[PDB]
Amino acid sequence: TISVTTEILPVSMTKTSVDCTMYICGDSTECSNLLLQYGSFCTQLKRALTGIAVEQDKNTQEVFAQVKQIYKTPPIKYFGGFNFSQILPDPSKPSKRSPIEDLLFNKVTLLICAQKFNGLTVLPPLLTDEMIAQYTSALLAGTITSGWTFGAGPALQIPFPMQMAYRFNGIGVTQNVLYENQKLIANQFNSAIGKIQDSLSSTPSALGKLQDVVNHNAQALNTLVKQLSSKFGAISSVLNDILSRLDPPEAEVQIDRLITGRLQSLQTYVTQQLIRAAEIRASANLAATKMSECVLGQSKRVDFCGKGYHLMSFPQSAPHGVVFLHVTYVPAQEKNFTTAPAICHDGKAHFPREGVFVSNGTHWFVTQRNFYEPQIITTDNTFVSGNCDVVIGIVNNTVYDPLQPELDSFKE
Amino acid sequence: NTLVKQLSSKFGAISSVLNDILSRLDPPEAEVQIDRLITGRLQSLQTYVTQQLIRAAEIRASANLAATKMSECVLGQSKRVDFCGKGYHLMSFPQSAPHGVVFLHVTYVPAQEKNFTTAPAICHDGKAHFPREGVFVSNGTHWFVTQRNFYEPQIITTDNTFVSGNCDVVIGIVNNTVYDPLQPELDSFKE
Amino acid sequence: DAVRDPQTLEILDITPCSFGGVSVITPGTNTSNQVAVLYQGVNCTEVPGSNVFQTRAGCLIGAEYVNNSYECDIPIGAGICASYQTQSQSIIAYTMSLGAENSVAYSNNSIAIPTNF
Ligand SMILES: *[C@@H]1O[C@H](CO)[C@@H](O[C@@H]2O[C@H](CO)[C@@H](O)[C@H](O)[C@H]2NC(C)=O)[C@H](O)[C@H]1NC(C)=O
Ligand SMILES: *[C@@H]1O[C@H](CO)[C@@H](O[C@@H]2O[C@H](CO)[C@@H](O)[C@H](O)[C@H]2NC(C)=O)[C@H](O)[C@H]1NC(C)=O
Ligand SMILES: *[C@@H]1O[C@H](CO)[C@@H](O[C@@H]2O[C@H](CO)[C@@H](O)[C@H](O)[C@H]2NC(C)=O)[C@H](O)[C@H]1NC(C)=O
Ligand SMILES: *[C@@H]1O[C@H](CO)[C@@H](O[C@@H]2O[C@H](CO)[C@@H](O)[C@H](O)[C@H]2NC(C)=O)[C@H](O)[C@H]1NC(C)=O
Ligand SMILES: *[C@@H]1O[C@H](CO)[C@@H](O[C@@H]2O[C@H](CO)[C@@H](O)[C@H](O)[C@H]2NC(C)=O)[C@H](O)[C@H]1NC(C)=O
Ligand SMILES: *[C@@H]1O[C@H](CO)[C@@H](O)[C@H](O)[C@H]1NC(C)=O
Ligand SMILES: *[C@@H]1O[C@H](CO)[C@@H](O)[C@H](O)[C@H]1NC(C)=O
Ligand SMILES: *[C@@H]1O[C@H](CO)[C@@H](O)[C@H](O)[C@H]1NC(C)=O
Ligand SMILES: *[C@@H]1O[C@H](CO)[C@@H](O)[C@H](O)[C@H]1NC(C)=O
Ligand SMILES: *[C@@H]1O[C@H](CO)[C@@H](O)[C@H](O)[C@H]1NC(C)=O
Ligand SMILES: *[C@@H]1O[C@H](CO)[C@@H](O)[C@H](O)[C@H]1NC(C)=O
């Protein structure tokens, strides 16, 4: 059974910047002179947020920008009967995005913009959505046209059924299994893509991580703006009323507590953003590693690129994240048999070159491990090692020689 | 440097020097003069320690990645794609650096390309012949088998291929002759 | 956000000041001395000598938009990057080039095999 699963990984968040004077002081003059005496806190906060923004710009570059050249699919689209229409971009839409990417964009929902006008500025990302989609399309065209050859060096053309035969040969299944079951595997793959198209749409809690990222950013900015209107043990929370009602020698000490409160709130916001940036960096590094291993090649690591024996992976872009579609091979309907470690023929122990000795109850065969394909035990399927009295569990059988009867028939 | 510069601030006090304040006033409000200096310097120290903790947390992850790369790339050969350099990994060499390590990754890259005609299987006597390892390659006239990552054509023999099924189920099978190395030597020397 | 006028019974919406950050774009100080100026997130009708360009990131003054595409050198944002080059020497702004465009001649009976390494 061919199975196709999802994995959603956040890659970045929103880039933000804050002003020293404007947030703490509402364009007051003496407030600036009082804030200047404290030192250089907001220089450190500005450098921290600038480093965070540069890191967030680098995070998306380390994941998507991994191809040397931009690839395209041929205008004719027939890949061995496999049908890739759900992941390739649709030229009818003015944005070259697949139906899966359109569904992921419409699923994530990004007056509150005017409230963040107290020194807070949201900076746009360097890479826009169309450019990231062009990277995604180039990766898809490279991985369905050239296989894993373009990830190491120059791209080498190969037919897709032969690429599937190569991928089967890497998980312990001989390539004759695919070529004798091409239509069934193509139908299973198409059915899996058709099911996973609306598996995300049926459940509204699938894209929890990206929504959590945008909600965390929104509530952090919102609670900063809320805390801007607090009193911190003063007579008033607005500077213009308190400066214009008391004389400066008492107004100074009365607004110093406002300065300290707003400064501490800024420090808390910057520290929380730094911790979230570290977490997002770890997630982006994991996503970049998964793009390098699952998409550009075949991974032998267990449960890394999905559940089961890994076959391929396809990348899709999402708001502040990436989605991997892992295509894996899963075993199915089982049969049990009696097995032996070796075969005794003429006082010599015969061990399988590759596979396993199987009996239905009457005769003995040798077959490959992950698929039932019994064959006659010949002298080329086995190798001789030692005598018969050292291996326990050895059984009585014969080994057919494809050489002796040809000579004793043809020579005479 | 920022810590040492910040040490010379006032934080709302009359002076930035403790000895200047102490020799200027009497104690019972010199203590409230210096309490603001105390608050500012504790805040500065806590900020510095928090930043150092975050930077050390980042440095730990970088060092763990470096240790993993030293264990995998240098002490063995890695099959992970684009881990120990670009291309098929061959070797790696470590070098020391001030507060860091430098890995020299030796890898293998294909250089010059040619295209041929390919088939998934070969039909000989109503039976399908699949490659044991490699790929079927035609220059235009005859058919050979070769390994994947290097061009090395060889005559299609009965030891380079294996038999699986008849000649009616594989899409794209072509007609060819598989040379048996056994029967000409037995048709020459027996007679 | 909005107020009623006390004399005429009228809705008035209030929007606060534009403001924003200013940034400078320069090459190395030994290469040249001329710079470009970026005003972040503002419309170019609120900035007060030609070569004024409107960008989704902001307003850019001192650099000219070129329809060609190159590798990014100094990033502004929204796919816009600046560089110092001839056309004598000047600072230009452009859209990023992702890479060389390539076509792979895929076919159902063709394979490519390397002959050298
Ligand atoms: C690949 O899958 C797509 C999507 O299911 C198929 O497009 C459908 O084709 C049928 C038959 O003409 C139409 O009724 C549907 O409306 C099409 N769907 C869409 C979304 O356009 C497509 O035919 C498949 N490709 C092949 C070669 O069979
Ligand atoms: C497997 O075959 C061997 C063939 O030699 C059997 O061993 C012989 O069994 C007979 C009958 O009991 C004895 O007379 C011989 O002395 C045995 N020879 C040896 C070398 O032990 C053997 O019994 C068969 N079965 C198993 C389970 O091993
Ligand atoms: C494909 O390769 C075969 C390899 O045998 C080429 O056939 C040989 O060509 C050379 C050069 O003329 C002759 O000296 C040999 O006698 C040929 N061998 C045989 C068995 O006939 C063949 O020419 C190649 N085809 C192309 C189009 O280059
Ligand atoms: C070469 O391949 C062809 C098909 O391209 C085979 O021709 C078939 O042969 C069988 C058995 O003789 C006939 O029943 C079919 O009618 C043939 N098909 C066609 C389309 O003609 C042929 O057997 C292969 N081998 C040789 C030696 O010619
Ligand atoms: C593979 O490429 C190498 C270079 O990477 C080729 O070696 C060159 O061979 C020519 C012809 O003899 C010499 O003039 C050059 O000096 C060689 N270069 C180097 C770096 O040694 C080699 O010939 C190529 N192999 C094949 C089979 O084409
Ligand atoms: C297969 O297992 C079942 C129990 O699960 C057992 O009854 C049966 O005999 C086994 N078959 C063979 C051929 O050993
Ligand atoms: C086991 O397989 C062989 C294959 O020749 C067959 O003859 C035999 O009947 C099978 N055993 C049973 C119990 O069906
Ligand atoms: C190799 O590819 C080129 C185009 O890249 C094509 O013209 C040529 O026919 C191909 N050669 C063969 C033998 O198929
Ligand atoms: C105030 O005076 C203006 C003068 O034109 C008039 O239109 C308006 O209706 C007056 N106020 C009220 C509350 O009606
Ligand atoms: C800038 O203001 C002008 C004048 O109102 C307007 O036409 C233009 O669309 C504005 N530009 C942007 C990018 O909003
Ligand atoms: C191989 O390619 C052509 C053109 O893309 C396609 O229509 C055809 O079905 C394939 N060839 C055969 C013999 O099936």
Side-chain angles (χ1 to χ4, degrees):
Chain A
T1 292
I2 311 288
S3 67
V4 171
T5 68
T6 49
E7 188 181 334
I8 296 100
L9 281 150
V11 72
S12 73
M13 41 171 186
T14 72
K15 316 159 60 177
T16 186
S17 171
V18 67
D19 190 9
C20 297
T21 308
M22 185 180 288
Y23 176 80
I24 298 148
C25 299
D27 82 12
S28 292
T29 61
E30 39 269 30
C31 189
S32 306
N33 310 104
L34 294 174
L35 179 49
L36 188 153
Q37 185 177 3
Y38 265 78
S40 68
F41 289 165
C42 67
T43 295
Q44 327 189 17
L45 319 179
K46 212 189 71 197
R47 293 180 293 173
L49 289 177
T50 305
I52 283 175
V54 170
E55 191 178 42
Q56 297 295 321
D57 265 330
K58 182 174 72 68
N59 262 355
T60 68
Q61 200 93 20
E62 294 293 328
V63 185
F64 294 104
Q66 282 176 356
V67 297
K68 277 75 69 177
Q69 293 179 356
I70 306 296
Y71 300 97
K72 293 188 287 185
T73 58
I76 190 167
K77 278 172 182 41
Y78 176 64
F79 303 120
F82 296 75
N83 186 51
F84 288 105
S85 77
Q86 297 289 324
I87 53 176
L88 275 296
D90 170 45
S92 81
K93 212 257 184 182
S95 188
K96 312 304 167 205
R97 291 190 316 201
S98 50
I100 310 285
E101 292 184 63
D102 291 331
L103 167 64
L104 296 155
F105 206 79
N106 287 1
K107 182 64 69 177
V108 163
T109 61
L110 291 154
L111 300 176
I112 59 169
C113 295
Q115 313 309 327
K116 294 156 183 45
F117 288 175
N118 304 329
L120 310 155
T121 300
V122 168
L123 317 175
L126 168 63
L127 274 195
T128 190
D129 289 350
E130 294 75 348
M131 294 177 71
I132 286 172
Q134 284 186 243
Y135 288 165
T136 290
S137 173
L139 276 157
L140 274 166
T143 193
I144 78 175
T145 300
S146 60
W148 60 72
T149 61
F150 85 110
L156 318 172
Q157 40 187 305
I158 180 169
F160 194 86
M162 293 177 71
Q163 167 179 352
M164 269 300 141
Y166 282 15
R167 305 243 182 193
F168 275 0
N169 208 69
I171 64 169
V173 185
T174 55
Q175 53 203 110
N176 58 337
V177 168
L178 168 78
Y179 293 129
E180 292 172 357
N181 307 287
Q182 204 167 332
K183 267 198 163 65
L184 173 70
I185 296 186
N187 291 350
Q188 291 188 14
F189 182 43
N190 300 344
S191 301
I193 300 299
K195 267 177 295 183
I196 191 167
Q197 203 278 328
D198 62 357
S199 177
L200 292 172
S201 167
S202 291
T203 58
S205 73
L207 283 85
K209 293 181 181 180
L210 311 176
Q211 205 90 28
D212 279 0
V213 166
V214 305
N215 289 356
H216 287 336
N217 179 82
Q219 65 183 357
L221 281 167
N222 190 359
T223 191
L224 187 65
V225 176
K226 297 290 181 68
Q227 180 98 330
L228 187 48
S229 86
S230 294
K231 275 159 57 172
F232 305 93
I235 61 170
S236 171
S237 74
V238 65
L239 294 174
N240 298 349
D241 186 74
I242 182 174
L243 61 83
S244 82
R245 185 179 67 189
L246 293 174
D247 46 345
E250 298 88 302
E252 190 277 331
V253 56
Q254 210 64 4
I255 59 179
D256 173 77
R257 296 185 283 230
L258 290 186
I259 303 311
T260 57
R262 296 177 179 180
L263 213 56
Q264 183 192 347
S265 174
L266 262 179
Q267 296 294 141
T268 307
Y269 169 69
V270 169
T271 303
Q272 183 62 255
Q273 283 276 314
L274 277 161
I275 290 169
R276 274 173 184 162
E279 159 167 7
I280 280 288
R281 160 150 42 77
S283 177
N285 282 339
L286 177 63
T289 301
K290 259 170 186 271
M291 176 87 78
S292 277
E293 304 215 4
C294 312
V295 180
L296 307 185
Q298 214 189 7
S299 182
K300 300 294 187 291
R301 311 172 58 179
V302 184
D303 291 331
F304 188 48
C305 314
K307 290 296 259 163
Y309 305 135
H310 179 241
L311 280 188
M312 293 177 71
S313 296
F314 302 117
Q316 304 286 286
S317 48
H320 300 330
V322 72
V323 168
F324 289 100
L325 266 70
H326 296 313
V327 187
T328 55
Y329 168 99
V330 177
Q333 314 170 21
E334 294 83 3
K335 278 186 56 57
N336 63 6
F337 317 86
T338 315
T339 184
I343 291 283
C344 202
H345 180 224
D346 269 0
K348 303 185 294 294
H350 281 104
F351 296 85
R353 217 179 274 278
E354 65 183 1
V356 56
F357 285 139
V358 175
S359 178
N360 50 30
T362 74
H363 295 105
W364 288 83
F365 306 123
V366 65
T367 187
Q368 64 183 357
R369 293 180 181 177
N370 305 125
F371 201 74
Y372 189 50
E373 188 146 281
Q375 301 158 19
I376 314 297
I377 317 187
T378 72
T379 187
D380 68 85
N381 287 328
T382 63
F383 66 94
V384 176
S385 178
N387 51 344
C388 202
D389 61 357
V390 64
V391 193
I392 62 170
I394 194 163
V395 301
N396 296 114
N397 205 26
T398 194
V399 176
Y400 165 73
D401 199 0
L403 187 153
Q404 183 66 41
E406 202 155 290
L407 307 176
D408 73 16
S409 78
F410 186 79
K411 294 179 180 179
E412 289 182 353
Chain B
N1 272 352
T2 45
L3 193 65
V4 173
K5 299 298 293 295
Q6 184 178 182
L7 188 48
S8 86
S9 309
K10 288 165 177 45
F11 305 93
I14 61 170
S15 168
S16 176
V17 183
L18 210 58
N19 293 323
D20 273 14
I21 297 169
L22 271 178
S23 79
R24 187 182 294 273
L25 282 72
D26 60 357
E29 69 274 16
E31 82 169 65
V32 67
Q33 281 304 312
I34 62 182
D35 174 77
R36 297 185 282 229
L37 288 188
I38 299 310
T39 56
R41 293 175 177 178
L42 277 296
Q43 198 192 0
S44 175
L45 264 181
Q46 293 179 356
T47 308
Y48 169 70
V49 175
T50 304
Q51 295 295 325
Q52 283 278 313
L53 276 163
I54 289 170
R55 276 175 184 164
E58 159 167 7
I59 281 288
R60 157 148 43 77
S62 177
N64 281 340
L65 178 61
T68 302
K69 261 171 187 272
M70 161 87 63
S71 277
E72 305 217 5
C73 313
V74 179
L75 307 185
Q77 212 189 7
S78 184
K79 308 302 196 297
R80 310 172 58 179
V81 186
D82 193 0
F83 188 48
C84 313
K86 291 297 260 163
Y88 305 135
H89 180 242
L90 278 188
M91 293 177 71
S92 295
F93 302 117
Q95 305 287 285
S96 49
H99 301 330
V101 73
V102 168
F103 289 100
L104 265 69
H105 296 313
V106 187
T107 55
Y108 179 88
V109 175
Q112 312 172 201
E113 293 83 3
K114 277 184 55 56
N115 55 20
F116 317 97
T117 314
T118 185
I122 291 282
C123 202
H124 180 45
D125 270 2
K127 69 176 55 83
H129 280 284
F130 298 85
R132 217 179 273 277
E133 64 183 1
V135 57
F136 284 139
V137 174
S138 178
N139 64 6
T141 73
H142 321 119
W143 289 84
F144 306 124
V145 64
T146 175
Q147 64 183 357
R148 273 135 193 171
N149 305 125
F150 202 74
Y151 189 52
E152 193 156 343
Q154 293 179 356
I155 314 297
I156 315 187
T157 61
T158 199
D159 67 85
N160 290 328
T161 61
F162 67 95
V163 176
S164 178
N166 56 345
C167 199
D168 291 331
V169 73
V170 191
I171 297 90
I173 195 162
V174 302
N175 284 340
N176 206 26
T177 62
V178 163
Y179 165 73
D180 196 1
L182 183 63
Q183 63 84 30
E185 201 155 290
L186 294 174
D187 289 10
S188 80
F189 184 80
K190 294 179 180 179
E191 303 176 1
Chain C
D1 196 6
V3 293
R4 298 293 298 273
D5 184 277
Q7 284 152 1
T8 176
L9 277 296
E10 187 60 33
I11 301 299
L12 294 174
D13 187 340
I14 318 178
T15 285
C17 299
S18 45
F19 64 89
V22 64
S23 303
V24 64
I25 297 169
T26 181
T29 192
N30 62 6
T31 294
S32 177
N33 277 30
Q34 65 182 357
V35 298
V37 182
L38 182 63
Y39 292 92
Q40 297 177 353
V42 298
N43 189 358
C44 302
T45 61
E46 301 170 0
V47 59
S50 193
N51 262 12
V52 163
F53 183 61
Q54 184 51 302
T55 316
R56 184 178 182 270
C59 200
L60 188 77
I61 300 171
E64 46 183 359
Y65 194 79
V66 178
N67 296 132
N68 303 124
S69 291
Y70 301 99
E71 306 313 282
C72 183
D73 196 18
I74 315 176
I76 295 90
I80 306 289
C81 292
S83 183
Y84 191 48
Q85 90 174 24
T86 178
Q87 185 178 2
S88 59
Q89 301 294 112
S90 64
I91 302 191
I92 56 172
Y94 49 83
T95 308
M96 293 177 70
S97 174
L98 308 161
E101 183 66 27
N102 191 15
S103 295
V104 194
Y106 170 81
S107 191
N108 57 42
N109 53 6
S110 71
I111 201 169
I113 289 165
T115 63
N116 211 7
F117 49 80

